[PDB]
Structures are given as structure tokens and as C-alpha cells.
Amino acid sequence: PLESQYQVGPLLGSGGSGSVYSGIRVSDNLPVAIKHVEKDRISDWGELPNGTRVPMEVVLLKKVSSGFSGVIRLLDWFERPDSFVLILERPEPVQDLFDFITERGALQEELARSFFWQVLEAVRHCHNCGVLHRDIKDENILIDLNRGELKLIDFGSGALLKDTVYTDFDGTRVYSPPEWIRYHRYHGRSAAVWSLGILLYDMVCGDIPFEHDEEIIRGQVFFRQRVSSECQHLIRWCLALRPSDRPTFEEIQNHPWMQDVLLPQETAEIHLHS
Ligand SMILES: O=c1[nH]c(-c2ccccc2Cl)nc2c1oc1ccc(Br)cc12
């Protein structure tokens, strides 16, 4: 072991995330991303389907890791004195949905439907694996511009999925459901549907619908862009004040607006010039 194995490129970003660097597996030049998370700053630990102390992020990543390209793969990880180092895949070329939206503005419905569909499949995948992501949002989605495939990233606020209530949250507040803001409780799935509601609004209008606590609590959605009535209908549904008034993933995917999505390949051809 040890990082004579990878060649550390430029810093790609930093935050509550820690710091992510571009990398190249020296073995075969596979593009990779090297995430460093400091121990002091990690609140949630778990332990491996073998038993040694790791951050939950790595548990979660290990549970979702597979052939499915809809969630970033964990390639490997190391422990250091005050940090863990995660080696993740890196699509190339790549752009995060935030930058993409910053740069191209409100997305056309055709494009948002394909992107949104792929997010749905990704999140469903996580749920099939027992992992709840807890921070679904445009900065946590990567676009593989060549294949037109979205990848979900950053499980550093995830949890194991369960059917009982959550009384802790450390995702993004502006994407968090009203029940979180008032009572500090939420159930997982329905809280994801709320953030998917925010996400689809973000895509189709170019920005999140709510900045403030009272706007979330109120949950009146105003539309700043031209958006089809069906789209609005689905957005408003996801953003129902009462959790159980929200659609299941199956109801979302069978919604009229989600009909006849482009394959990811056709998506890149049409909308990404690839
Ligand atoms: O977990 C991540 N957080 C972040 C992230 C997000 C927002 C702000 C700062 C960082 Cl480090 N980026 C990535 C993360 O995993 C990645 C895998 C491949 C590539 Br390319 C990028 C990432």
C-alpha cells in the first residue's frame, strides 16, 4: 500500500467535504479523485462488514459500490494519523450540476427530465443498498459529459436507511424538509422526495425555490421561469408540506412528466455536444 500508487493532480474542491484532488492511478492511469477527510471533523463513525473503526461515509460508499454507474464508486481507502483518504472514480471530462446550471441557466424540460430520471435511479439504488444519501443537491451530482451519465457523490452526511424517524441532520438546510425545520424530525424517503422536489425546481428554473426558514415552512412554490404545468405539478407534489402527501419514487417515475426520457447517450448527443 501507500501513495506511491497514485499521482496527485490539482485540487478540485474543498469544504465541509474536506478536500478533493485529481489523481491518476499509476498502475494503469485510471483517472481518480483523492478525497481527504480530517478525523476531528468526522462526527459519524461505523464499522466494516468485518469490524474495524471507519467513518460512516466509507461504510455507505462500500454498500453502494457496484457496476451501476449512477453512484460514484469507492476504489480504495487509507487511514493516516489525522485523516482518511478515499480514492473515488473520476469521470473525465466532467462537470457538476451546479456549474452546469450556473453556466447554462434553467434547463430545458427534456434535459431536466433525463437528468432527474437518472438521479431517481441513483437514489433508488442507494435505497436498495440500505443507504440514505441525505444531501441530494446539484453540487452533489456529477455529469460525465461524454456518456451523458449523472453520478451521485458525497455520502458524508448519509446514514444507514431505516423506517423509524431521524432526529439528526447535517445536510444542506435549503434542501431540507419543513418537518426538519420545525420539529427536528424526519423519515428518510419522504425527506429525499422533498430534496428531489427542490432539485427538480433548481433544474427547471435555474435556482432553488427557497432561501429562508419561513419559506420552507410555508412551502408556497412560485415559478420564476416558464415551466410546463405537468412539471409544476410534480414539483409541487414532491414539495407537499405533509410527508405522506409526497409521492413515492414509483409515483414520481410514473408521473406524466417523466414519460419518454432520453437515454443518457442521446442526452449527451443532443444537449452536451458529445
Ligand atoms: O465526495 C465528494 N465531495 C466533493 C466536493 C463537493 C463540494 C465541495 C467540495 C468538495 Cl471536495 N467533490 C467530490 C466528491 O467525490 C468526488 C468524486 C469525483 C470528483 Br471529480 C469529485 C468528487
Same domain, 87 and 129: no
CA 165 to the chain's CA centroid: 21
CA distances from 72 to 32, 33, 47, 122, 145 (A): 11, 10, 20, 10, 15
Domain that holds residue 233: 93-274
Q: How far apart are CA 248 and CA 90, in angstroms?
A: 31
33 C-beta closer than 6 A to ligand 1 = yes
Same domain, 81 and 97: no
Same domain, 78 and 210: no
In 10 A of CB 173, how many CB atoms?
Answer: 14
Angle between helix axes 109-128 and 264-271 (nearest 10 degrees) is 150
Q: How far apart are CA 13 and CA 94, in angstroms?
A: 14
- Cell readout for 106 is 434553467
Bridge pairing between strands 11-15 and 83-89: unpaired
189-194 contacts at long range (C-beta below 8 A, 24 or more positions apart): 189/127, 189/132, 189/161, 189/248, 189/249, 190/243, 190/244, 190/246, 191/134, 191/166, 191/243, 192/123, 192/132, 192/133, 192/136, 193/238, 193/246, 193/247, 193/248, 193/249, 193/252, 194/238, 194/239, 194/246
Beta-bridged to residue 151, according to DSSP, are: 142
Q: Please give the distance, rounded to the nearest whole angstrom, from the Cα atom of residue 88 to the centre of ligand 1.
A: 9
For the CA atoms of 156, 157, 159, 165, what is the dihedral angle to 10 degrees?
A: 180
Annotated catalytic, 135? Answer: yes
- Cell readout for 264 is 443518457
Distance, first Cα to last Cα, the chain? 37
Q: How far apart are CA 213 and CA 258, in angstroms?
A: 30
Same domain, 87 and 102: no
- Cell readout for 216 is 420552507
Q: How far apart are CA 139 and CA 154, in angstroms?
A: 9
The CATH number of the domain holding residue 225 is 1.10.510.10
Question: 28, exposed or middle or buried, with CB in 10 Å at 0-12, 13-18, 19+?
Answer: exposed
- Which atom of ligand 1 is nearest the CA belonging to 12? 11
What single letter denotes the amino acid at residue 172?
A: T
Measured in angstroms, the resolution is 2.6
Beta-bridged to residue 160, according to DSSP, are: 131
88 C-beta closer than 6 A to ligand 1 = yes
Last residue of a domain, one of 58, 92, 126: 92
96 C-beta closer than 6 A to ligand 1 = no
To test the ligand 1 pocket, which listed residue (11, 17, 21, 131) has its Cβ within 8 A of the most ligand atoms?
Answer: 17
Same domain, 60 and 108: no
Q: How far apart are CA 20 and CA 85, in angstroms?
A: 9
Tell whether omega for the bond before 93 is within 30 degrees of 0, i.e. cis. Answer: yes
137 C-beta closer than 6 A to ligand 1 = no
Same domain, 110 and 38: no
Whether residue 274 contacts residue 148, with contact meaning beta carbons closer than 8 Å, is answered with yes
- Cell readout for 203 is 433544474
Domain count, the chain: 2
Reduce the secondary structure of the chain to three states and give it as a string: CCCCCECCCCEEEEECCEEEEEEEECCCCCEEEEEEEECCCCCCEEECCCCCEEEHHHHHHHHHCCCCCCECCEEEEEEECCEEEEEEECCCCEEEHHHHHHHHCCCCHHHHHHHHHHHHHHHHHHHHCCEECCCCCHHHEEEECCCCEEEECCCCCCEECCCCCECCCCCCHHHCCHHHHHHCCECHHHHHHHHHHHHHHHHHHCCCCCCCHHHHHHCCCCCCCCCCHHHHHHHHHHCCCCHHHCCCHHHHHCCHHHCCCCCHHHHHHHHCCC
The CATH number of the domain holding residue 50 is 3.30.200.20
